[PDB]
């Protein structure tokens, strides 16, 4: 679990979105596993606007943050699950690191701010859904 709070927006993994998220929907994209809903309070997370490939992520299954090198956002094949059929998930970045299903939503940050959230994993790898291209999150 976990979300990004920026301005009047809440960013979560689409497969973990609540009824409230869907009732206050701004934008969603199944291919990116992202959903953005509106909030009544002001969010203070800073979104990074950069091409960093190093950062730190929060891993709830270890209660620890880990430093990682990660790939550039791209289309990566993701195994079928209870939420989606087998497909290419876009805007995904992989890193060598520990992750478990309940880890989705953990933030990845670089020195410039929030980069994305944990969205996939398996076999000593962890995948992050990028949010750096969503320029509208700041306006």
Ligand X SMILES: CSc1ccccc1CC(=O)N1CCC[C@](O)(C(N)=O)C1
Q: Min. distance of Cβ 47 from Zn ion in angstroms?
A: 10
> Do 125 and 96 form a contact (C-beta atoms < 8 A)?
yes
Residue of 59, 128, 58, 133 whose CA lies nearest to 93: 128
Q: 29 an active-site residue? A: no
Residue 13 or 37 with smaller CB distance to ligand X: 13
Instruction: Output the smallest distance, CB 126 to Zn ion, in A.
Output: 18
**Binding to ligand X by residue 134, rule CB under 6 A?**
no
Q: Which of 91, 72, 90, 75 is nearest to 131 (CA)?
A: 91
Q: Does 121 bind ligand X (CB under 6 A)?
A: yes
Q: Indicate whether 93 belongs to the interface with ligand X (CB under 6 A).
A: no
Greatest Cα pair distance in the chain: 39
The residue ranges that bind Zn ion (CB under 5 A) are: 48, 50, 52, 110, 112
């Amino acid at each position: 679990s976990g979300a990004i709070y920026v301005g009047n927006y809440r960013v979560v993994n689409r497969h973990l979105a609540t009824h409230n998220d869907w009732a206050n929907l701004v934008w969603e994209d199944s291919s990116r596993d992202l959903l953005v809903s509106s909030t009544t309070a002001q969010g203070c997370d800073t979104i990074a606007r950069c091409d960093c490939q190093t950062g730190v992520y929060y891993c709830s299954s270890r209660r620890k943050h880990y430093p990682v090198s990660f790939s550039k956002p791209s289309l990566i094949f993701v195994e079928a699950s209870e939420y989606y059929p087998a497909r290419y998930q876009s805007h995904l970045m992989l890193a060598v690191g520990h992750s478990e299903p309940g880890d989705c939503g953990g933030i990845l940050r670089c020195q410039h701010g929030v980069v994305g959230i944990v969205s996939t994993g398996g076999n000593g790898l962890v995948g992050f859904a990028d949010v750096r291209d969503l320029l509208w999150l700041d306006e």
